[PDB]
Design an enzyme around this catalytic site. Structure first.
Site, PDB file in Angstrom:
ATOM      1  N   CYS A  60     -38.606   9.314  28.889  1.00  0.00           N
ATOM      2  CA  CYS A  60     -40.074   9.458  28.933  1.00  0.00           C
ATOM      3  C   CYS A  60     -41.028   8.235  29.143  1.00  0.00           C
ATOM      4  CB  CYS A  60     -40.560  10.119  27.927  1.00  0.00           C
ATOM      5  SG  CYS A  60     -39.656  11.437  26.959  1.00  0.00           S
ATOM      6  N   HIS A 113     -49.216   9.772  24.326  1.00  0.00           N
ATOM      7  CA  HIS A 113     -47.936  10.023  24.901  1.00  0.00           C
ATOM      8  C   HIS A 113     -48.016  11.667  24.696  1.00  0.00           C
ATOM      9  CE1 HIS A 113     -43.290  10.903  24.411  1.00  0.00           C
ATOM     10  NE2 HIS A 113     -43.567  10.776  25.838  1.00  0.00           N
ATOM     11  N   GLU A 123     -47.216   9.482  16.168  1.00  0.00           N
ATOM     12  CA  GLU A 123     -48.067   8.751  17.249  1.00  0.00           C
ATOM     13  C   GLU A 123     -49.548   8.359  16.539  1.00  0.00           C
ATOM     14  OE1 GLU A 123     -48.750  10.442  21.266  1.00  0.00           O
ATOM     15  OE2 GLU A 123     -49.459   8.369  21.829  1.00  0.00           O
ATOM     16  N   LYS A 161     -51.074  15.536  28.946  1.00  0.00           N
ATOM     17  CA  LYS A 161     -50.102  16.459  28.912  1.00  0.00           C
ATOM     18  C   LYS A 161     -50.336  17.719  28.612  1.00  0.00           C
ATOM     19  CE  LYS A 161     -46.209  13.026  28.255  1.00  0.00           C
ATOM     20  NZ  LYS A 161     -47.380  11.805  27.889  1.00  0.00           N
ATOM     21  N   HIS A 194     -45.217  18.033  30.143  1.00  0.00           N
ATOM     22  CA  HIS A 194     -44.693  16.508  30.042  1.00  0.00           C
ATOM     23  C   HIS A 194     -43.820  16.532  31.341  1.00  0.00           C
ATOM     24  CE1 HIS A 194     -41.940  13.816  27.248  1.00  0.00           C
ATOM     25  NE2 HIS A 194     -42.374  13.258  28.499  1.00  0.00           N
ATOM     26  N   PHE A 248     -37.711   9.642  24.401  1.00  0.00           N
ATOM     27  CA  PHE A 248     -36.362   9.924  23.743  1.00  0.00           C
ATOM     28  C   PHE A 248     -35.374   8.694  24.003  1.00  0.00           C
ATOM     29  CE2 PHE A 248     -37.903  14.200  25.453  1.00  0.00           C
ATOM     30  CZ  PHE A 248     -38.207  14.722  24.068  1.00  0.00           C
TER      31      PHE A 248
END
Length: 413
Positions: A164, A303, A314, A335, A340, A399
């Site tokens: 990511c 994110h 987050e 997003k 994503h 990830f």
């Protein structure tokens, strides 16, 4: 070592809400939803029925049919976005400066569709049938390889693969090349074409994807009812350029890139670390790199995956870093609209962060209807908001425990 200043002089993108960066951003400000019923694959064949696809993308505006067949879709996106970014920047790459212009474009999973296709040929028709171009087409650095050839860029030609955080690391890495004097310009970002049957099978087996079939509610970052991320595709590329070089040619300057932070969770291969421990350190490092105190940040492009763990962790990391200022700044996850994009997300989002500075307008987190008791910061839910934005950060907490944050600031000589 007298660190060079580095600015952004060009942007280029293809996203689920537009086949160019400006249309994408205009749609973002409008709260346009890029998630819809899947068409790339037959939704009847999968537990997941929706995705954020590019709409009516036309690779023939960039490549002849023959050339395009020798490249995976993720590389089409890299090429198109790089072309638009180079054109936008007005930078001329020729024999006099080719050595000083490089490429740093990442992809998270590379040419998955190509591997599927070529493997089926191998199984059905044997090894001889496999294309001579199979290996190049599949590897994630083919974005960088093809872009370097296309524009004649002879400086460093590299690719960072961090899931990511791919594009976020790639841009930061390119930023550091220029900062230390090893290039005058860099074509940099990320590109991903992960809407394939194996990719879906994998993320579904990993329980990473929302199984909510309603495009109107599936992706809801920071919402109390969020239940997983929605897969998207595309690319975002920027032209980074040493400041004096940009000024000498009269380049348009979007903003200065001033900070890069990157850390590891060392926790788990797919789950993020409790409390956003690593993410907090990445943001703090990025602002330290920029020489700014936390109170200077106006906007965070989160994110914002829409997973239960990410959005909460987050938020916790943001509170950790920004303290009393955490409630004062504004946050959004775009997003919520683009889905994503995986590896390409940092590139698309850096572009949105840049245009937030230009327009002093923050794109909403859409679908934010049910306030989460833990995620209680200001996510600019539903509607775009006018705000004086001078310093922005963009987060990718991916990830594999890969944490990366970039900081951009309004240009002041």
């Amino acid at each position: 070592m007298d660190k060079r200043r580095v600015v952004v002089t060009g942007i280029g993108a293809v996203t689920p809400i537009g086949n160019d960066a400006e249309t994408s951003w205009e749609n973002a400000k409008k709260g346009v939803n890029g998630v819809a019923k899947m068409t790339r694959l037959n939704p009847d064949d999968f537990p997941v029925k929706i995705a954020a696809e590019l709409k009516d993308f036309d690779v023939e505006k960039y490549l002849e049919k023959k050339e395009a067949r020798k490249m995976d879709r993720f590389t089409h996106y890299a090429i198109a976005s790089a072309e638009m970014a180079v054109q936008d920047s007005g930078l001329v790459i020729d024999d006099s400066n080719a050595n000083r212009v490089g490429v740093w474009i990442g992809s998270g999973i590379g040419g998955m569709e190509t591997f599927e296709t070529q493997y089926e040929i191998f199984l059905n028709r044997g090894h001889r049938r496999v294309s001579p171009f199979f290996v190049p087409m599949m590897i994630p650095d083919m974005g960088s390889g093809q872009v370097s050839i296309r524009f004649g860029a002879k400086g460093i030609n590299s690719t960072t693969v961090t899931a990511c955080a791919t594009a976020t690391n790639s841009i930061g890495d390119a930023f550091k090349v220029i900062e230390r004097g090893d290039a005058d310009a860099m074509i940099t970002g990320g590109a991903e074409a992960p809407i394939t049957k194996m990719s879906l099978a994998g993320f579904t087996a990993n329980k990473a994807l929302s199984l909510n079939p309603d495009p109107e509610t599936a992706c809801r970052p920071f919402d109390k009812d969020r239940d997983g991320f929605i897969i998207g595709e595309g690319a975002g590329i920027v032209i980074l350029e040493e400041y004096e070089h940009a000024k000498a040619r009269g380049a348009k300057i979007y903003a200065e890139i001033v900070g890069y932070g990157a850390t590891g969770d060392a926790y788990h291969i797919t789950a993020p670390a409790p409390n956003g421990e690593g993410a907090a350190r990445a943001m703090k490092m990025a602002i330290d790199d920029a020489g700014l105190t936390p109170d200077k940040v106006d906007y965070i492009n989160a994110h914002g995956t829409s997973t239960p763990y990410n959005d909460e962790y987050e938020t916790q990391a943001i509170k950790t870093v920004f303290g009393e200022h955490a409630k004062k700044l504004a946050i959004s996850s775009t997003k919520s609209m683009t889905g994503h994009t995986l590896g390409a997300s940092g590139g698309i989002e850096a572009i949105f962060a840049l245009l937030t500075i230009r327009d002093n307008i923050i794109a909403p987190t859409i679908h934010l209807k049910n306030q989460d008791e833990v995620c209680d910061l200001d996510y600019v839910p539903n509607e775009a908001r006018e705000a004086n934005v001078n310093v922005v950060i963009s987060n990718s907490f991916g990830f594999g425990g890969h944490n990366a944050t970039l900081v951009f600031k309004r240009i002041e000589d």
